[PDB]
């Protein structure tokens, strides 16, 4: 998270951290608890080579990474079959927890949004995660979960920006319909926020508009952060997740 | 070049080295002389952002990189407008030299293939360049130009290979028609060979079949090196390159 | 600490972490509270050049580094004047806290040994710290204080060990009288434990035998960790820290 | 070499490069040809662990490192027995080549100084090598041999300077009599020059005054490069080298 602040203990109870097995259970991506036994994250986080569930683990909302851990095994990993590389979209994936988690005031699902919901500029939206605080600047210990309000923009506007100072023809589309852009030169996601949630408060309710997909610009002018637009994938998501 | 050998001083008089100014005029990609004043290379080598001409120089055939540099200025950089990323093809570009080069026996142009040429498996082909000799193993000094013979395969055969061990659905195509695959677990291009030539001898003549596009495999099984199929872009090349 | 275990919340209440300000107050050396207002550490930790007091903080006993910090400012830094380099001894220093500290069973001083006290072999001693767990293997987060019991050995035995596999002359002393060696190929101190305590329980009382001086062996055979012999510098220490 | 320039091809015919077998025959230290079959260098270059002669070769004067290697085997290495660490001196060693070298105008020995020559300030002296051109800045390809004129200073003044900004007591000697200091804040040796020569022109003849010993300062104010004073070791040298 670039340009944000440490999150209040009470915020984002659906924020999760995906851990892979190395010298320790190291965070490699973020994700969200959309259902008691399901986690929404990014495809690029799980691929490219199919992984062994024994190596992955899910950690629930935690003020400080690695402190009070309690890893959870995963029974199933589903990566959208259209996914091949971030720049061509379909960067979304699901993790089936091994068993439901005890939902409480401190830990629960986030509501997915209505298919009709586009998220026009002005909508108050925040990205959260344990990513770098700047280009090649890791989140320093004790690793507080951070958040940052980011302006959301329309795809065609984002597409125009991406062509600025680039060789790519104006007529070739960079930003796809299954993507959503947010952030400016001072506020953005950054390395390690991938898979995590972009949430907007609509009618007093928090909805997950996106899944951090491209988090490497770290607030780079004319290259806002790119997110997988959840509305575009509800049917796929509901093909595996209930309620 | 992974698994090759140093090239004979007489071979590949079309090979060029693209240099960017850092503490010195450092090699960052290969290229090929296709006309006395035109160099053929990969688009991703010049991208993403539009580059200023004054930061780039071209170096003609050298047995050893950096030893006898005679850097040449570039007057025009033309990146294919369809190019955005390696995985979506159109990875090709042209550099117009500020001046034409003195053609001789040590240095001359390589011939482009007939639009009809498909370079089917079993065809005798070589990849050349100053790229790494293995993963995370840079070409050691004195940086001899290397070469390695590679088995060119068919697109669908490559497409299939790329799906092995991948979440990507056999439904979605990975290898496009403007791409060409070659190399195996022993012979392949590697980091730094990018933009260089893949040439094959056809009926007694060397023809440039491809341009190194994806060289990060370095002989990784089932992920062979990907090249830009030159036949596919002859129209686009001839719009700029005469003779 | 190599081959040790996480330490119980109740053990080693005199352990301290020295922080230098960078992107965050990063741990660079250990130390021991030996008086309500004085910390004992290694001279090589504060040198080579004189340091700005403001760049230094002291963190008292803590189970996990960074998680519950209560950084304390230092009023004086006193490096033993005889110190030039580790290998020539006198690797010892004193930090006078800006203010005395409240003592509890969780945080209190460690007693220095009597001038005559000797820690012959077979004697049970422990070394604690937040240093690497192995060569180039940083202690992973949440950085629990680690501990390990180490065999104290006889200098001449240590001196001879250090001459094994080296060109240095058998007749040239490597291990000085103000030094003391402990550890073996399985248990030892490692990068980052420097400045910390080597304590041995004697007559039912914990006494600090040494200060980690040379901790880069990380359980290397024939290169056991070297500590500064606290007894040797009792006079100097006493000339600054009362009682 | 810091603040220096490329050496004319006709200069320093005695410079040598010591190579260690890694991915290629890599330079790890300089040295000088002091006799058709003997090379003078620094002990620290050859240790600490005893080296296997199979992994070592000597390369005679070359204008550009690695470009025209003709590696030479070594039959014997003699590390001064008093050597332990650079800071305590005796940093000197000898390498006996398997065969004498044919001496030509391009490659020949450097003369050792008379026991009485003290090389006072003002003497015109030069240090040569292929080390870094500044702190953490490697000499770039094509790796020209570099040279730089350095002002020689008196041992006691050098010793005084090394105590400025240091905790080390003025009564503790840093610069020993077997040491010699040269260089200033703009001109000096740098990492990789170690082992190479410090030569001064005396009465129209080049005499090797020192062996680069401490070369990590790279023109750090009040921390001039330290060299092993050759006259101090003439006897040890002549015990092995003929003529």
């Amino acid at each position: 998270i670039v340009g944000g602040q440490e999150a209040p203990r009470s915020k984002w109870p659906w924020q999760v951290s995906l851990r892979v097995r190395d010298r320790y259970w190291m965070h490699f991506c973020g994700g969200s608890l959309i259902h008691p036994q399901w986690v929404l994250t990014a495809a690029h986080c799980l691929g490219p080579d199919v992984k062994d569930l024994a190596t992955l683990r899910v950690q629930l909302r935690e003020q400080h990474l690695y402190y009070q851990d309690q890893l959870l095994p995963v029974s199933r990993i589903i990566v959208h079959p259209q996914f091949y590389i971030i720049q061509t979209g379909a960067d979304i994936a699901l993790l089936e927890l091994e068993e439901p988690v005890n939902i409480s005031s401190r830990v629960h699902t986030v509501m997915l949004p209505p298919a009709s919901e586009t998220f026009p500029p002005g909508m108050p939206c925040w990205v959260t995660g344990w990513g770098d605080v700047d280009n090649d600047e890791p989140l320093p210990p004790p690793f507080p979960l951070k958040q940052v309000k980011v302006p959301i923009m329309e795809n065609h506007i984002c597409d125009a920006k991406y062509h600025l100072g680039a060789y790519t023809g104006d007529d070739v589309r960079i930003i796809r319909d299954d993507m959503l852009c947010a952030g400016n030169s001072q506020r953005d996601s950054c390395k390690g926020d991938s898979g995590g949630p972009l949430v907007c408060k609509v009618n007093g309710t928090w909805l997950q508009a996106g899944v951090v997909s491209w988090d490497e610009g770290c607030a780079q002018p004319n290259r806002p952060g790119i997110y997988t637009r959840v509305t575009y994938y509800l049917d796929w998501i509901h093909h595996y997740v209930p309620k």
Side-chain angles (χ1 to χ4, degrees), chain A residues 36-48:
Chain A
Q37 190 175 180
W38 293 93
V39 166
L40 179 61
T41 192
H44 87 258
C45 286
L46 289 331

mmCIF file of all heavy atoms in Angstrom, chain A residues 36-48:
data_model
loop_
_atom_site.group_PDB
_atom_site.id
_atom_site.type_symbol
_atom_site.label_atom_id
_atom_site.label_comp_id
_atom_site.label_asym_id
_atom_site.label_seq_id
_atom_site.Cartn_x
_atom_site.Cartn_y
_atom_site.Cartn_z
ATOM 1 N N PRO A 36 -17.636 -18.182 4.385
ATOM 2 C CA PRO A 36 -17.066 -18.975 5.484
ATOM 3 C C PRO A 36 -16.039 -20.042 5.103
ATOM 4 O O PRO A 36 -15.152 -20.366 5.896
ATOM 5 C CB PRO A 36 -18.304 -19.562 6.148
ATOM 6 C CG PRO A 36 -19.287 -18.436 6.027
ATOM 7 C CD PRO A 36 -19.090 -17.994 4.583
ATOM 8 N N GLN A 37 -16.146 -20.596 3.904
ATOM 9 C CA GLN A 37 -15.175 -21.601 3.485
ATOM 10 C C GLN A 37 -14.505 -21.223 2.162
ATOM 11 O O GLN A 37 -13.803 -22.032 1.532
ATOM 12 C CB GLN A 37 -15.853 -22.973 3.380
ATOM 13 C CG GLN A 37 -14.891 -24.136 3.188
ATOM 14 C CD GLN A 37 -15.583 -25.486 3.219
ATOM 15 O OE1 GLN A 37 -14.943 -26.528 3.079
ATOM 16 N NE2 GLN A 37 -16.899 -25.474 3.405
ATOM 17 N N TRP A 38 -14.700 -19.982 1.737
ATOM 18 C CA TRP A 38 -14.089 -19.548 0.484
ATOM 19 C C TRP A 38 -13.332 -18.235 0.529
ATOM 20 O O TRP A 38 -13.754 -17.260 1.174
ATOM 21 C CB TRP A 38 -15.127 -19.447 -0.617
ATOM 22 C CG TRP A 38 -15.682 -20.740 -0.998
ATOM 23 C CD1 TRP A 38 -16.808 -21.315 -0.506
ATOM 24 C CD2 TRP A 38 -15.162 -21.636 -1.983
ATOM 25 N NE1 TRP A 38 -17.031 -22.513 -1.128
ATOM 26 C CE2 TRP A 38 -16.037 -22.739 -2.040
ATOM 27 C CE3 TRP A 38 -14.045 -21.613 -2.826
ATOM 28 C CZ2 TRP A 38 -15.832 -23.820 -2.912
ATOM 29 C CZ3 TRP A 38 -13.834 -22.684 -3.694
ATOM 30 C CH2 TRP A 38 -14.727 -23.775 -3.729
ATOM 31 N N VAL A 39 -12.215 -18.218 -0.187
ATOM 32 C CA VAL A 39 -11.373 -17.032 -0.268
ATOM 33 C C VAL A 39 -11.199 -16.628 -1.733
ATOM 34 O O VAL A 39 -10.986 -17.475 -2.623
ATOM 35 C CB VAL A 39 -9.991 -17.287 0.409
ATOM 36 C CG1 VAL A 39 -8.973 -16.179 0.046
ATOM 37 C CG2 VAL A 39 -10.173 -17.294 1.909
ATOM 38 N N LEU A 40 -11.338 -15.328 -1.976
ATOM 39 C CA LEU A 40 -11.180 -14.766 -3.318
ATOM 40 C C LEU A 40 -9.783 -14.109 -3.368
ATOM 41 O O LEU A 40 -9.403 -13.332 -2.492
ATOM 42 C CB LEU A 40 -12.300 -13.730 -3.607
ATOM 43 C CG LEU A 40 -12.287 -12.998 -4.964
ATOM 44 C CD1 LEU A 40 -12.421 -14.003 -6.064
ATOM 45 C CD2 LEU A 40 -13.393 -11.951 -5.044
ATOM 46 N N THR A 41 -9.019 -14.450 -4.390
ATOM 47 C CA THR A 41 -7.678 -13.911 -4.540
ATOM 48 C C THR A 41 -7.415 -13.803 -6.032
ATOM 49 O O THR A 41 -8.341 -13.935 -6.833
ATOM 50 C CB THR A 41 -6.631 -14.846 -3.880
ATOM 51 O OG1 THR A 41 -5.368 -14.174 -3.799
ATOM 52 C CG2 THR A 41 -6.472 -16.118 -4.695
ATOM 53 N N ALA A 42 -6.168 -13.564 -6.415
ATOM 54 C CA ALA A 42 -5.847 -13.434 -7.827
ATOM 55 C C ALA A 42 -5.229 -14.683 -8.408
ATOM 56 O O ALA A 42 -4.415 -15.342 -7.765
ATOM 57 C CB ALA A 42 -4.897 -12.274 -8.034
ATOM 58 N N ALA A 43 -5.598 -14.993 -9.640
ATOM 59 C CA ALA A 43 -5.032 -16.149 -10.316
ATOM 60 C C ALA A 43 -3.502 -16.096 -10.376
ATOM 61 O O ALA A 43 -2.838 -17.079 -10.055
ATOM 62 C CB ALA A 43 -5.570 -16.232 -11.714
ATOM 63 N N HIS A 44 -2.944 -14.954 -10.798
ATOM 64 C CA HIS A 44 -1.500 -14.832 -10.931
ATOM 65 C C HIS A 44 -0.784 -15.187 -9.641
ATOM 66 O O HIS A 44 0.386 -15.574 -9.648
ATOM 67 C CB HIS A 44 -1.089 -13.423 -11.453
ATOM 68 C CG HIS A 44 -0.918 -12.370 -10.396
ATOM 69 N ND1 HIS A 44 -1.869 -11.405 -10.142
ATOM 70 C CD2 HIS A 44 0.128 -12.087 -9.580
ATOM 71 C CE1 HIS A 44 -1.416 -10.572 -9.219
ATOM 72 N NE2 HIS A 44 -0.206 -10.963 -8.861
ATOM 73 N N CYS A 45 -1.494 -15.078 -8.529
ATOM 74 C CA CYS A 45 -0.901 -15.421 -7.253
ATOM 75 C C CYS A 45 -0.669 -16.928 -7.115
ATOM 76 O O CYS A 45 0.320 -17.349 -6.527
ATOM 77 C CB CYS A 45 -1.794 -14.955 -6.121
ATOM 78 S SG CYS A 45 -1.788 -13.160 -5.842
ATOM 79 N N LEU A 46 -1.575 -17.739 -7.652
ATOM 80 C CA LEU A 46 -1.440 -19.186 -7.533
ATOM 81 C C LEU A 46 -0.592 -19.840 -8.603
ATOM 82 O O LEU A 46 0.094 -20.821 -8.329
ATOM 83 C CB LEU A 46 -2.818 -19.861 -7.512
ATOM 84 C CG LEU A 46 -3.699 -19.690 -6.267
ATOM 85 C CD1 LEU A 46 -2.816 -19.504 -5.050
ATOM 86 C CD2 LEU A 46 -4.618 -18.503 -6.410
ATOM 87 N N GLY A 47 -0.646 -19.308 -9.820
ATOM 88 C CA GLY A 47 0.115 -19.888 -10.914
ATOM 89 C C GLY A 47 1.581 -19.487 -10.922
ATOM 90 O O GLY A 47 2.085 -18.942 -9.935
ATOM 91 N N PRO A 48 2.296 -19.738 -12.033
ATOM 92 C CA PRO A 48 1.782 -20.373 -13.256
ATOM 93 C C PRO A 48 1.674 -21.897 -13.189
ATOM 94 O O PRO A 48 0.750 -22.485 -13.752
ATOM 95 C CB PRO A 48 2.773 -19.911 -14.322
ATOM 96 C CG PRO A 48 4.058 -19.864 -13.564
ATOM 97 C CD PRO A 48 3.654 -19.206 -12.254
#
